[PDB]
Every structure is written in structure tokens, then in C-alpha cells.
Design a protein around this ligand. Structure first.
Ligand SMILES: COc1cc(-c2cnc3[nH]cc(C(=O)NC(C)C)c3n2)cc(OC)c1OC
Length: 264
């Protein structure tokens, strides 16, 4: 959890606090890492972030190496060389539909685990799915994430409104079902090859559209089954909206179906 700064080697910027690629000399190897670096509230956020990641043990969730205090406060995590899913698909338009399915199923597996762990993510978007390889996705960015109280199935709170469920907007209530809503948006982005959802619309206009029972259209080349899954994620009523255990299963099965044809 606590790291020796002199074992860390930063490069002179992935994004902009800032995220920078670095090297942490480990027990025997040198490990490539991503380092989140800050510009009191800001410092406690980072430790809260680190506390959440510490509690999570799953192949489809970014792993924290530890925290560092030097020039600035620094959060050191495993590196995802291919970066954010939305950018990847934007620059790689010929990624196959099967490959996209495989990646979003991987995200659902990570989310299924987060649910069983009683954590809400609250920033689940394609920008926060990071690619270790073209066939290996991990969930990142636990800056807004909350551990649910033992006696509550939701957390009561700028928001990424286009990814938030009606109950988040209407009642400030975040649950795993809210994350499922965000996952639908993320699915939409993945099949739209990393285009922004609700193009040209303001936050308030989105809320209005959703209130009328309208949902985003089926992306070009997206299988009807995956668009059916998207819309089910976008179930307005929280009770009728599926959980991640159901979602992961629907994706597991349809991925295995598609794989079977790739041979047939
Ligand atoms: C390889 O290209 C990029 C890679 C990354 C990146 C890679 N590995 C990571 N591990 C934890 C991260 C992390 O905490 N990321 C937060 C920014 C979500 C994180 N971000 C981020 C990028 O832009 C943000 C990139 O595009 C230049």
C-alpha cells in the first residue's frame, strides 16, 4: 500500500490532476504502472479511491499497486497499454462485433463481482474501461465508487449525467441497478465504436427524452440481441431492471452463441 518513491520512475502524460505512465521496481521485476497524480478534499478522495481498489480482487478490475506521497499525492496502479475502450474503438474501426461482445461481457463479469461485493461504481463508462489487450478489458476509475452500508442497497449522494439512471437524477440514489443503467450506455458506446451517447443533447434534454420512454437507437452493425440487452439495462423502474448476475449471464450465453457460429 505504501510505496518507496525512489523505486518509481515517471515519464515526462497519458491524460489531463494528471495520469502518467511509470515504472515501479518490484520484488524482482520492474513493473510498468499508471500513476494518477494530483494538482484537502482532493487528497482524501485519492485515499478513498485507494481504499476501494484495495478491497477488490478480480481479473476484470484494474489493480492498485499502492499510494505515494512526494511532489504530489500519487496513486499507482497496473498499466493498461491499449488504454480507454472508447478511444481504442475510435481509432480501430474494424474491430469485429464478436470482439466487442467479448469485451463488454468481460466488463459485465467485473461488474457482477462489484455487485456481489456490494460496491457501486458510479462512473461506469467506456472511457473507464481500459484495454490490457484487444481481448482483455478491465474496469478503472473508482474515484466515485462507494461501499454500500450493511443495511442499505443504495448510496445517497459534476455528474456524468448521460450515464446515470433516472433514480440517480431524481432521488440521488445509487445502487448496482444504477450501475446496470450505466452499463447499457457503455454497451451503446462500445457498439457505436466509441462515439458519445446522446450526441448534441444537453443533460436536461436527456432526462426529458428518457421520461418520454425514448431510448438511444441501435448502433450500425449491432446485433439485435445486444440492443435488446441495452434496452433492458435501460429499464426505468429499478426493481424490474436486471442485476449484473442476469446481465453477465445474458452476455455469457450470447458470446458463446456467436463463438459457435464463427466455427459453423
Ligand atoms: C494507453 O493510453 C491511455 C492509457 C490510460 C491508462 C492506462 N492504464 C491505467 N491504469 C489505471 C488508469 C487510470 O486510472 N485511468 C483513469 C484516467 C481512468 C489507467 N489509464 C489512460 C489514457 O487516457 C486517460 C490513455 O490515453 C492516452
Amino acid at each position: 500500500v505504501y510505496l518507496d518513491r525512489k523505486l518509481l520512475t515517471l515519464e515526462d502524460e497519458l491524460g489531463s490532476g494528471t495520469v502518467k505512465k511509470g515504472y515501479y521496481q518490484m520484488k524482482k521485476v520492474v513493473k510498468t504502472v499508471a500513476v494518477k497524480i494530483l494538482k484537502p478534499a482532493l487528497k482524501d478522495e485519492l485515499l478513498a479511491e485507494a481504499n476501494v481498489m484495495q478491497q477488490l480482487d478480480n481479473p476484470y478490475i484494474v489493480r492498485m499497486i499502492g499510494i505515494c506521497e512526494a511532489e504530489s499525492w500519487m496513486l499507482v496502479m497496473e498499466m493498461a497499454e491499449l488504454g480507454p475502450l472508447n478511444k481504442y474503438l475510435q481509432q480501430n474501426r474494424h474491430v469485429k462485433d464478436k470482439n466487442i461482445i467479448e469485451l463488454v461481457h468481460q466488463v459485465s463479469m467485473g461488474m457482477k463481482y462489484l455487485e456481489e461485493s456490494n460496491f457501486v461504481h458510479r462512473d461506469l463508462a467506456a472511457r473507464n474501461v481500459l484495454l490490457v489487450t484487444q481481448h482483455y478489458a478491465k474496469i478503472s476509475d473508482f474515484g466515485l465508487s462507494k461501499a454500500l452500508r450493511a443495511d442499505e442497497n443504495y448510496y445517497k449522494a459534476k455528474w456524468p449525467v448521460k450515464w446515470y439512471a433516472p433514480e440517480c437524477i431524481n432521488y440521488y440514489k445509487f445502487s448496482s441497478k444504477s450501475d446496470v443503467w450505466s452499463f447499457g450506455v457503455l454497451m451503446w458506446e462500445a457498439f457505436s465504436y466509441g462515439q458519445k451517447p446522446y450526441r448534441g443533447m444537453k443533460g436536461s434534454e436527456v432526462t426529458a427524452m428518457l421520461e418520454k420512454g425514448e431510448r438511444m437507437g441501435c448502433p450500425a452493425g449491432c446485433p439485435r440481441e445486444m440492443y435488446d440487452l441495452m434496452n433492458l439495462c435501460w429499464t426505468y423502474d429499478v426493481e424490474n431492471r436486471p442485476g449484473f448476475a442476469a446481465v453477465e449471464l445474458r452476455l455469457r450465453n450470447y458470446y458463446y452463441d456467436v463463438v459457435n457460429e464463427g466455427h459453423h
